[PDB]
Design a protein around this nucleic acid. Structure first.
Ligand SMILES: [Zn+2]
Ligand SMILES: [Zn+2]
Ligand SMILES: [Zn+2]
Ligand SMILES: [Zn+2]
Ligand SMILES: [Zn+2]
Length: 143
DNA sequence: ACGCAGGTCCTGGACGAAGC
DNA sequence: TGCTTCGTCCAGGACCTGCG
C-alpha cells in the first residue's frame, strides 16, 4: 500500500524496485546461495546448509529406539511412526493405510490406471518408472 | 520369471515462523 | 519493522524387498 512493481513470473507485488529485483532471483537463480562443492543454488542459506550434508554424509537426527540416523528431522519423524505402528495416511478409495505419506500418494495413483512409462524396446507399459528401470535391466541381460 | 507394489529414507522447493 | 535465516511440511524420487 501502495505497490507498483510486479513480478512478470508469479505476479507478486512490491513497493520498491530493489525488492522486486531481490525476489526475481528465485526464478532466475542469479545471486542465490551457491554451494561451493557442487555449485548448485538454493533459495536461502539455511537450505544450502541442509544441502551440505549430502556431501558430508552427516545424519544428525538419530532414532532413540533403534539407533539409526537420518539427514532430516522430518525423515526421523516419519521413521518413528514405523516403530509405533502409526498409519495416519489412508487411501480414500480402498482404505489401505500407510505410515509414509509418499507411499500413500504413490498408491492412490494406481486407481487411475495410468501407465505412462513405456519400454522403448518392447512397448510394455508401467505405472511406475521404478518398474520400467528394472524391466530394462532384463533387456540388458538378454543382450 | 518378473511384473507388481509396498517399505524405506534421501533431497529440496514451499512458506510461514523466528532471528537480527 | 523489514530483510534474512530457520523450522517444518510436503512432494517427489532412488533403492530395496517380497508376493503371486
Ligand atoms: Zn516472482
Ligand atoms: Zn553441493
Ligand atoms: Zn528407529
Ligand atoms: Zn487405494
Ligand atoms: Zn521391454
Amino acid at each position: 500500500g501502495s505497490k507498483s512493481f510486479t513480478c512478470d513470473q508469479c505476479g507478486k507485488y512490491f513497493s520498491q524496485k530493489r525488492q522486486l529485483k531481490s525476489h526475481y532471483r528465485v526464478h532466475t537463480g542469479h545471486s542465490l546461495p551457491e554451494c561451493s562443492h557442487c555449485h548448485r543454488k538454493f533459495m536461502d542459506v539455511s537450505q544450502l546448509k541442509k544441502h551440505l550434508r549430502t556431501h558430508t554424509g552427516e545424519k544428525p537426527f538419530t532414532c532413540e529406539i533403534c539407533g539409526k540416523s537420518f539427514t532430516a528431522k522430518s525423515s526421523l519423524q516419519t521413521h518413528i511412526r514405523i516403530h509405533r505402528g502409526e498409519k495416519p495416511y489412508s487411501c480414500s478409495i480402498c482404505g489401505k493405510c500407510f505410515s509414509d505419506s509418499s507411499a500413500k500418494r504413490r498408491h492412490c495413483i494406481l486407481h487411475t490406471g495410468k501407465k505412462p512409462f513405456s519400454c522403448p524396446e518392447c512397448g510394455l507399459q508401467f505405472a511406475r518408472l521404478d518398474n520400467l528401470k528394472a524391466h530394462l535391466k532384463i533387456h540388458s541381460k538378454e543382450k
